[model samples]
Target: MSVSECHRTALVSGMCCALFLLILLTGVLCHRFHGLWYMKMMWAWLQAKR
Candidate 1:
């Protein structure tokens, strides 16, 4: 069996949209996590100075 024409188109578009969102989420999370990690490291360094 095979998918009908319109259904195939819909499936492709849905997959593309999902991929786009996944990539976008990955970038945002990486940026946020990198900043948080850097700040925490800095705080640890300062706390050790006392």
Candidate 2:
């Protein structure tokens, strides 16, 4: 592919991976803060928004 096409693909891939990891982190934070009901709720909200 041309340089611009390569850059566009990389940008899209990074965005998708970032979003995936963000969701994973949200779930992990919820688990880690299980005892903290407020924090857990916030994490759940983030996942819902994503």
Candidate 3:
């Protein structure tokens, strides 16, 4: 109900939002590329053997 109270809530919420986005993007990149996909491509190219 005080100015300080509202300011603290807004600051915490803003930080939470940023942290959520950082986690979400990290998950997306790991799922999209990870290691298995790249390994598969390299293996396929080597298998061509020419």
Candidate 4:
């Protein structure tokens, strides 16, 4: 592959990794806050409401 193509692939791979990490962290956070059921529910509902 050309240098430019390699660079583009690297950038896309990095972005995909970042999104994957973000999703993983979000799931972990939700699990951690599972005990705060009402608070978590309300917060999620408020976002939906808006």
lDDT of 4 by residue, 1-50 (tens): 67566688887999999988987898887777887977768989999997
Q: List the residue pairs that clash in candidate 3.
A: none
Model 3, 1-50: lDDT tens digits are 66566778887999999998997898887787888778888988889986
Each model's lDDT comes to 0.84, 0.82, 0.84, 0.83
The local distance difference test score of model 4 is 0.83
Decide which is better by TM-score, 1 or 4. Answer: 4
| Model 2 per-residue lDDT tens digits across residues 1-50 | 67566688887998989998987898887777777977668889988997
Colliding pairs, model 1? none
| Preferred candidate (TM-score higher): 1 or 3 | 1
Report the alpha-carbon TM-score of model 4 versus the true structure: 0.52
TM-score of each: 0.47, 0.52, 0.45, 0.52
The local distance difference test score of model 2 is 0.82
**Top candidate by lDDT:** 3
- Distance from true position, residue 3, model 2, in Å? 3.6
- Which residue ranges in model 4 land beyond 4 Å of their true spot? 1-4, 39-50
Off by over 4 Å in 3: 1-4, 31-50
